[PDB]
Amino acid sequence: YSFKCVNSLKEDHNQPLFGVQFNWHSKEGDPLVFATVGSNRVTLYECHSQGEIRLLQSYVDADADENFYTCAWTYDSNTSHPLLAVAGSRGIIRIINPITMQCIKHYVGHGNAINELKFHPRDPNLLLSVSKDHALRLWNIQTDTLVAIFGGVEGHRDEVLSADYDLLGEKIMSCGMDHSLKLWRINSKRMMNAIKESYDYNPNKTNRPFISQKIHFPDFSTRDIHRNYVDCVRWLGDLILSKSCENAIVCWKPGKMEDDIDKIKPSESNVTILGRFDYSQCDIWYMRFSMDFWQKMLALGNQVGKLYVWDLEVEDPHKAKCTTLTHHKCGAAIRQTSFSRDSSILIAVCDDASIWRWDRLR
Amino acid sequence: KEAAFDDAVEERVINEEYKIWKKNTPFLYDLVMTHALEWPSLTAQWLPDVTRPEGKDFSIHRLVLGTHTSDEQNHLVIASVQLPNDDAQFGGFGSVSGKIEIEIKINHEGEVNRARYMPQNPCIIATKTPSSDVLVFDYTKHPSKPDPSGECNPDLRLRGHQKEGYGLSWNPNLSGHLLSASDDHTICLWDISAVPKEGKVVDAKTIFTGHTAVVEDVSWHLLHESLFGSVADDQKLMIWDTRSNNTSKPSHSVDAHTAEVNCLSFNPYSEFILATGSADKTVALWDLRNLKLKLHSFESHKDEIFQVQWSPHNETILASSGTDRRLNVWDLSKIGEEQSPEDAEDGPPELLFIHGGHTAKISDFSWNPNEPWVICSVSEDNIMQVWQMAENIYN
Amino acid sequence: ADHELFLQAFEKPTQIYRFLRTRNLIAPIFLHRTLTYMSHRNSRTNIKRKTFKVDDMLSKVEKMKGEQESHSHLQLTFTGFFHKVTLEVLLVKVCHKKRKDVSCPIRQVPTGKKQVPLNPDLNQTKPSLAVSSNEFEPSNSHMVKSYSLLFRVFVAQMTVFDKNRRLQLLDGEYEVAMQEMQGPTLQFTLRWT
Amino acid sequence: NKRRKLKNKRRRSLPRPHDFFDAQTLDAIRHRAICFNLSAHIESLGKGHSVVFHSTVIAKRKEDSGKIKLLLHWMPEDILPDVWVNESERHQLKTKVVHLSKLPKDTALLLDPNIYRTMPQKRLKR
Amino acid sequence: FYQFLYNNNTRQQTEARDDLHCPWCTLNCRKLYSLLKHLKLCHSRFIFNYVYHPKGARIDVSINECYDGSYAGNPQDIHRQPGFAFSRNGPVKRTPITHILVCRPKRTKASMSEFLESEDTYSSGHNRLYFHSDTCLPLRPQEMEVDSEDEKDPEWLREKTITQIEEFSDVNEGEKEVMKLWNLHVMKHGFIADNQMNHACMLFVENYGQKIIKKNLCRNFMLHLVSMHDFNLISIMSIDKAVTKLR
Amino acid sequence: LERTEILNQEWKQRRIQPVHILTSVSSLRGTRECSVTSDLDFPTQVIPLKTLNAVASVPIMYSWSPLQQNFMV
């Protein structure tokens, strides 16, 4: 409803850019931050008044020359320090502590490569890693252990990139390249225990390692929803927000309207449709966007640099309040966007190693 | 601090320097052998009994080592190896089945500080331990297999020292008389031949308290049972004789070097030569006719040394082990003799080659009679190594 | 094509070579005079027959020509002082490294001084003398490092003993220069009574 | 096998064994490699094997005989124990280059403390 | 000369600064065989290639394409978390590995031709690092025997057939639950012969038939018991044992 | 609205440390530095790139389930 661009940047490595996320692990008044990950580079930025931006810490990786495109905010509940968990095309997870200015932690074992990193909304120590292996890998970062594994056999028939966390972290989602919609509860009795003993381990306690768990049955599945490449799925309470490469963002909830999300069965596949948000020229993958912390407004970038904005108030896609923000200079692509913890600051990524920062006119 | 990352650099440095060592040897050497152990050990010793099957070039040799672990239960392991005794070959020299076979384990508590058999009966062994008493075990009696309950039988165990200690030496001449040096400033002695089965525990027959400082090195002069030497961290050695009723009044004592000394070695083939090392990179020797006089010194080392042995079957050669991850050897017949200017930058003519291709700490080496040219290795990284020196360097 | 990327590809292990080549030029991995491909070094045969007991009397000869100390008791006079107030001189003693400590211990003992005025000019007078006994202890030097002298007021250090068993000093003219925090300096000479 | 070859039983297209080298230590080394290369001139003047020394006299010493002495400090700050010199060898030692091998045992870490880089650094356990 | 070549794209020829001296190591070998050997050894991180200079020697060198540089100690030393990794502060449990490099000095040579011909390993033990069969993470030396993962049935297969059985909209729950219980023990013990099936039934009872008694699903089981009887796998004497066990 | 504030409420509970900028390093003075410019008029900044720790080059394997039997399809 109110978002104009007053700032932009561009770096020198020229690689197509990757995900950016704003430091929602902050305080109302602390310096709010947003980072940026390159193919082998990682960096951060600071937002200042009058549109000013100062480049923060920057790191490179020359030994492992593979793309790094997955990141997740990290925070230490004990020492009250935020961090950032990053991974790329080799499946090794690196954790950066700006205060420590060093990356010292071992996380290897991933199959091919990681295509998503996210943390639990409450627990700042548990990281979600998604694989092109059609399986879901989990790591307890503080304990450096391997949390239960999802989608070993009964996962998506094609590559999986996208997932989501509810604010309780009650369940976890899987939406593969095959347009299927697979969901796993985290509130499982077996799951919750394995979380507890994940913190309960000692190398000298036993010769046995932390016995992980294989879980494969997804609580829901549907395929007729998307006829084209799906690359973005979200949660709106009991609703399943989703975006494909078909120039149509769509949201739905499984089965009938009265059906509660927490009582669904794996065998069920009924879906009743209630949403539609079409767009244009964004019919390609590698396209991710941002959602505000309060989950109220969205910023849909486009490969020509166009920004599609729609509100999620009582104003619904039935009326689809439109706002097609656009800047002329950028036309390469928009891999990712980043709403701030507040709604004031917006950051848009332009593919030619360039950034465009928009500010809300609150 | 800084050294944390500085030492973090060194693992890279030592890795390829070892790797450089590893490609240095094959084009310049005769016999590179090694093995990976399970737990680190402090005592390495060969079993002198050698079985050499005729025709089968692989000459079978056996080893004796202790055990040290982090938090598990240690044991007592006896190793074996068959090695090519012939030169005409080029598994490579024999069968592909294997040449090293080890299955002997007897439970040991603590870490094996100094475990050595007595020369007149290899079945009788005293093992220095962190505990006060000295464990006594027999391979003939104890099973090769570990006790599943973990209960060993350290029967007839020695005692006399209330703490642990380094340096365990039986008498080469006498039988049942051992010299033990511990943290108690004392030197304990036993008479096993006069000791019958008494409660599986033995106390010291006689105790000598010469050093006021902690004794950490004791050994009989290998040529005479009457005389016997002792070295402590008092920066000086202390020589002893028999009939010393004043068990604190020694036979001879003099300063040797300017740092801690806990190693001694006497010439077998010369009745009057005593050579000891010291932590301050120095190696030196002494003549019996001059107690306070050192014949020569060799500061060429680079770290602490406490393992020195006179090379057998050869008088002008002595081998040593050092904590610089290096192993050196010296020629005694070429002390400062004629050498080329190109020899000068490499070292003095008496100085000989430097071994040291180690990825972990080794400060203990050993051989056995009839095999002067072979060395066993034990490290913290659970490594055994056997090497046979190329002779073309010599003749 | 351009060789900037080609040389650095060669240079990267070359710097690794450069690091180690200097590093092993002090601590070589192996002795180079014994290599089969450089066995021409050490042309002498393995003459194990070299008699060793003769060293017992030879080392007696070696001992009788290597031992020394300082002459009787160190004494030195004073001369003019010129710089930008009395001054003092000190004697220091150093030890060696041990197994446990990270560095050698050092201790100092005062020896003398003079009451020089505030920067006296040339041709002062006929001026003072310093007296010190046999403070040096060669027996202590057997397990400690060589001793050294200090000068205060502005300070300089000089070493009196050596590890090679020779006295650095004698009865002669000296001109020692101090440093602050050419330049500061003082004249003096020694004597042997 | 009786027909066992030399240690070259590999093919020219095998995957790399992931060398234990890391970039960060090289970065510290190269800055270290150049820093004493300016102070000690190891690679510039000594060609990676020698160290230059420009003498700086401290004190003066004279005998009755034909002998005067000039104690010589040297500028590169990583130098041998100073020695006294006469005017004959003075105005000649103003630039003296010494090879690494001739340097004494003290110079093991004088050039750089990481040359030896004592691994244990303390008596944690014997 | 020391030619540096990059895939016929860049050619960095470098002259030999005097003869009989290495470029990098600068060792005073004083003869070519002892020199180029040292080039092969001290600089194996590159590749070596002698070329016949019309009078003397010429050298071309390039990158070692598959240089074997790597870690030499315990491969898991990297695999443990950093800080603990490469700590070198305590005993380590490492598997037995035995290697022999140099056995006997034959079939290995010097003189002029051996470098020219060059330009134109008794391993044993758990050498490489081994990984879990289930998690595919490195296997701890403390647990060689335990980390077998060799069982008669993986856990997920149990619910696969549970889903496969339960999907039948035409089958009652009482019969379904018993046969699920009946399926799950069969692969749990792997009994294939007729007496094994006879032994399976007497083991199904008195071990988990009490659970059937706890579940009270008897009448379906009795019809289940007569079914396998009529399927000629079970005799009359066996079916009464389950009947009497409840009663 | 109920859920978002609760997480924010918990977010209110835990204090969070601010950010710190880089500085010249004596051992890493010559570290290679990249430059980021502005598509707009904002100034251009140059900051070095500190390389991360070594990572083990591990071979690739594809997800599966442990199958100890042979099943018709």
Swiss-Prot record, chain A:
Q: Which residues carry this modification: N6-methyllysine?
A: K118, K189, K205
Answer yes or no on keyword Nucleus: yes
A GO molecular function term, named singly, is: enzyme activator activity
The chain residues annotated with the modification N6,N6-dimethyllysine are: K118, K189, K205
Where in or outside the cell it occurs: the entry states:
Nucleus; Chromosome
Carries keyword Transcription? yes
WD repeats (start-end): 12-55, 63-106, 109-149, 155-196, 225-262, 280-320, 329-362
GO process annotations (BP): cellular response to leukemia inhibitory factor; facultative heterochromatin formation; genomic imprinting; heterochromatin formation; negative regulation of DNA-templated transcription; negative regulation of transcription by RNA polymerase II; oligodendrocyte differentiation; regulation of adaxial/abaxial pattern formation
GO cellular component terms listed in the entry, alphabetical order: chromatin silencing complex; cytosol; ESC/E(Z) complex; nucleoplasm; nucleus; pronucleus; sex chromatin
Q: Which UniProt keywords apply?
A: Acetylation, Chromatin regulator, Chromosome, Disease variant, Host-virus interaction, Methylation, Nucleus, Phosphoprotein, Repeat, Repressor, Transcription, Transcription regulation, WD repeat
Per UniProt, what does mutating W285A do? Abolishes binding to H3K27me3
Q: Which disease is it linked to?
A: Cohen-Gibson syndrome: An autosomal dominant overgrowth disorder characterized by accelerated osseous maturation, advanced bone age, skeletal abnormalities including flaring of the metaphyses of the long bones, large hands with long fingers and camptodactyly, scoliosis, cervical spine anomalies, dysmorphic facial features, and variable intellectual disability.
**Can you say what this protein is called?**
Polycomb protein EED
The source organism is Homo sapiens
Taxonomy of origin reads: Eukaryota, Metazoa, Chordata, Craniata, Vertebrata
Swiss-Prot record, chain D:
Give all cystine bridges in this chain. Answer: none
MF annotations from Gene Ontology: DNA binding; transcription coregulator activity; zinc ion binding
Work out whether the entry's keyword set contains Acetylation. yes
Where Phosphoserine occurs, residue numbers?
Answer: S13
Compartment(s) where it occurs, according to its Swiss-Prot or TrEMBL record: Nucleus
Mind telling me which GO cellular component terms the entry cites?
Answer: chromatin; ESC/E(Z) complex; nucleoplasm
Transmembrane ranges, per UniProt, are: none
The Gene Ontology biological process terms listed for this entry are: chromatin organization; negative regulation of transcription by RNA polymerase II; regulation of transcription by RNA polymerase II
Q: Write out the biased-composition intervals (Basic residues).
A: 1-15
Give the principal location in a single coarse category. nucleus
- This protein's UniProt keywords: Acetylation, Chromatin regulator, DNA-binding, Metal-binding, Nucleus, Phosphoprotein, Repeat, Repressor, Transcription, Transcription regulation, Zinc, Zinc-finger
Tell me which domain of life the UniProt entry assigns to the organism this sequence originates from.
Answer: Eukaryota
| Quaternary context | Self-associates. Associates with the PRC2 complex, which consists of the core components EED, EZH1 or EZH2, SUZ12, and RBBP4, and various combinations of accessory subunits including AEBP2, JARID2, PHF19, MTF2 and EPOP. Found in a monomeric PRC2.2 (class 2) complex consisting of at least SUZ12, RBBP4, AEBP2 and JARID2. Within the PRC2 complex, interacts directly with SUZ12; competes with PHF19 for SUZ12 binding. Interacts with EED, EZH2, and RBBP4. May also interact with RBBP7.
The family this protein is said to belong to? Belongs to the AEBP2/jing C2H2-type zinc-finger family.
How is this protein named in the record?
A: Zinc finger protein AEBP2
The scientific name of the source species is: Homo sapiens (Human)
Where in the full protein does the shown chain start and end, and how long is the full protein?
378 to 503 of 517
Swiss-Prot record, chain E:
Where are the Phosphoserine residues found in this chain? S113, S118, S148
The record's account of tissue expression is: Overexpressed in breast and colon cancer.
Q: Where are the zinc fingers (C2H2-type)?
A: 20-43
Induction of its expression: Expression is induced by E2F1, E2F2 and E2F3.
Q: Where is this region: VEFS-box?
A: 128-204
Quote the subcellular location field of this record: Nucleus
Q: How is it modified after translation?
A: Sumoylated, probably by PIAS2.
Source organism, top-level taxon: Eukaryota
Q: Which family does it belong to?
A: Belongs to the VEFS (VRN2-EMF2-FIS2-SU(Z)12) family.
- Report the protein's function: Polycomb group (PcG) protein. Component of the PRC2 complex, which methylates 'Lys-9' (H3K9me) and 'Lys-27' (H3K27me) of histone H3, leading to transcriptional repression of the affected target gene. The PRC2 complex may also serve as a recruiting platform for DNA methyltransferases, thereby linking two epigenetic repression systems. Genes repressed by the PRC2 complex include HOXC8, HOXA9, MYT1 and CDKN2A.
What's the miscellaneous note? Answer: Under hypoxic conditions, the precursor SUZ12 RNA undergoes regulated trans-splicing with the JAZF1 RNA, resulting in a chimeric isoform which may be protective against apoptosis. The chimeric transcript is characterized by JAZF1 exons 1-3 joined to SUZ12 exon 2-16. The chimeric transcript is expressed primarily in the endometrium from late secretory and early proliferative phases of the menstrual cycle, but not in normal myometrium at any phase of the cycle. Its expression is slightly induced by low levels of progesterone, but suppressed by both estrogen and high levels of progesterone.
Q: What is this protein called?
A: Polycomb protein SUZ12
Per the UniProt entry, what species is this protein from, by scientific name?
A: Homo sapiens
Swiss-Prot record, chain F:
Quote the subcellular location field of this record: Nucleus
Please list the tissues where expression of this protein has been recorded. Answer: In the ovary, expressed in primordial follicles and oocytes and also in external follicle cells (at protein level). Expressed in many tissues. Overexpressed in numerous tumor types including carcinomas of the breast, colon, larynx, lymphoma and testis.
Where does the UniProt annotation place the signal sequence? none
State which residues carry a glycan (glycosylated): S26
Outline the segment boundaries, as ranges, of region: Interaction with EED. Answer: 1-19
Modification after translation is described as: Phosphorylated by AKT1. Phosphorylation by AKT1 reduces methyltransferase activity. Sumoylated.
List residues, modification Phosphoserine. Answer: S27
Q: What induces it?
A: Expression is induced by E2F1, E2F2 and E2F3. Expression is reduced in cells subject to numerous types of stress including UV-, IR- and bleomycin-induced DNA damage and by activation of p53/TP53.
Q: What does this protein do?
A: Polycomb group (PcG) protein. Catalytic subunit of the PRC2/EED-EZH2 complex, which methylates 'Lys-9' (H3K9me) and 'Lys-27' (H3K27me) of histone H3, leading to transcriptional repression of the affected target gene. Able to mono-, di- and trimethylate 'Lys-27' of histone H3 to form H3K27me1, H3K27me2 and H3K27me3, respectively. Displays a preference for substrates with less methylation, loses activity when progressively more methyl groups are incorporated into H3K27, H3K27me0 > H3K27me1 > H3K27me2.
Family, as annotated? Belongs to the class V-like SAM-binding methyltransferase superfamily. Histone-lysine methyltransferase family. EZ subfamily.
Q: What is this protein called?
A: Histone-lysine N-methyltransferase EZH2
Q: What stretch of the whole protein does this chain cover?
A: 50 to 122 of 746
